Design an enzyme around this catalytic site. Structure first.
Site, PDB file in Angstrom:
ATOM      1  N   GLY A 264       0.828  -1.205   0.000  1.00  0.00           N
ATOM      2  CA  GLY A 264       0.000   0.000   0.000  1.00  0.00           C
ATOM      3  C   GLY A 264       0.856   1.246   0.000  1.00  0.00           C
TER       4      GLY A 264
ATOM      5  N   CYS B  26       5.643   0.191   7.586  1.00  0.00           N
ATOM      6  CA  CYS B  26       5.342   1.345   6.748  1.00  0.00           C
ATOM      7  C   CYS B  26       6.630   1.833   6.107  1.00  0.00           C
ATOM      8  CB  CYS B  26       4.718   2.472   7.593  1.00  0.00           C
ATOM      9  SG  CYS B  26       4.246   3.935   6.648  1.00  0.00           S
TER      10      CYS B  26
ATOM     11  N   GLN C  15       2.835  10.236   1.541  1.00  0.00           N
ATOM     12  CA  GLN C  15       4.141   9.547   1.641  1.00  0.00           C
ATOM     13  C   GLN C  15       5.090   9.914   0.526  1.00  0.00           C
ATOM     14  OE1 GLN C  15       2.172   5.413   2.276  1.00  0.00           O
ATOM     15  NE2 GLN C  15       4.231   5.399   3.224  1.00  0.00           N
TER      16      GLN C  15
ATOM     17  N   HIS D  67      -2.891   7.702   6.814  1.00  0.00           N
ATOM     18  CA  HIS D  67      -1.918   8.686   6.246  1.00  0.00           C
ATOM     19  C   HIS D  67      -2.565   9.985   5.802  1.00  0.00           C
ATOM     20  CE1 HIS D  67       1.927   6.569   6.376  1.00  0.00           C
ATOM     21  NE2 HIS D  67       1.410   5.501   5.738  1.00  0.00           N
TER      22      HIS D  67
ATOM     23  N   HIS E  13      -4.895   1.505   7.240  1.00  0.00           N
ATOM     24  CA  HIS E  13      -3.534   2.061   7.406  1.00  0.00           C
ATOM     25  C   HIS E  13      -3.278   3.203   6.437  1.00  0.00           C
ATOM     26  CE1 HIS E  13       1.004   1.614   8.071  1.00  0.00           C
ATOM     27  NE2 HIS E  13       0.962   2.297   6.904  1.00  0.00           N
ATOM     28  N   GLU E  14      -3.619   2.989   5.165  1.00  0.00           N
ATOM     29  CA  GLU E  14      -3.391   4.035   4.147  1.00  0.00           C
ATOM     30  C   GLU E  14      -4.280   5.284   4.313  1.00  0.00           C
ATOM     31  OE1 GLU E  14      -0.715   3.999   2.555  1.00  0.00           O
ATOM     32  OE2 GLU E  14      -0.187   1.906   3.001  1.00  0.00           O
TER      33      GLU E  14
HETATM   34 ZN   LIG Z   1       2.144   3.584   5.745  1.00  0.00          ZN
END
Ligand SMILES: [Zn+2]
Length: 148
Positions: A44, A92, A49, A138, A134-135
């Site tokens: 992912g 991550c 990021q 972000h 999780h994504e």
């Molecule tokens: Zn991450």
């Protein structure tokens, strides 16, 4: 090219903004995100990021049958989460050399626009539900280490 930002960079903490969908632009972003993700063996990635604070994620689903593939999810939103939780050992690309067990809902419903700009709603569980939560974190300026 896209460079992956790492913990300590303040852009990982700024919330991401809604995207007005453009098929050609999303195609370009998708190609570059996938490249960055796969180059580092991730499954992912979220736009912040790579220094882009827009609400876009990619989620790998590479298979023996169809080869390398990843879902684009533009303006993803969780509209439902299960009461039932599951524990998973997370890492991550933006938090290198750190891992840990995180409790999250086992299943979710997520709405988004896909690669082609169609509005989707999927019920996810297992690893897909995990990577999506999780994504999307972000996009809220949340890193998984925050849960410890
Ligand atoms: Zn991450």
């Amino acid at each position: 090219s896209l460079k992956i930002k790492t913990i300590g960079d303040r852009c990982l903490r700024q919330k991401s903004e809604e995207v007005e969908f453009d098929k050609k632009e999303m195609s370009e972003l998708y190609d570059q995100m996938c490249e960055a993700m796969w180059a580092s063996d991730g499954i992912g990635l979220a736009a912040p990021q790579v220094g882009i604070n827009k609400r876009v994620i990619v989620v790998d689903e590479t298979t023996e049958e169809h080869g390398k593939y990843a879902h684009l999810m533009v303006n993803p939103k969780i509209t439902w989460k299960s009461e039932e939780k599951v524990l998973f050992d997370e890492g991550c690309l933006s938090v290198p050399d750190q891992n840990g067990e995180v409790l999250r809902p086992k299943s979710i419903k997520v709405t988004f626009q896909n690669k082609d700009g169609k509005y989707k709603k999927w019920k996810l569980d297992g690893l897909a539900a995990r990577v999506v939560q999780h994504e999307i974190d972000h996009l809220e300026g949340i890193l998984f280490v925050d849960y410890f």
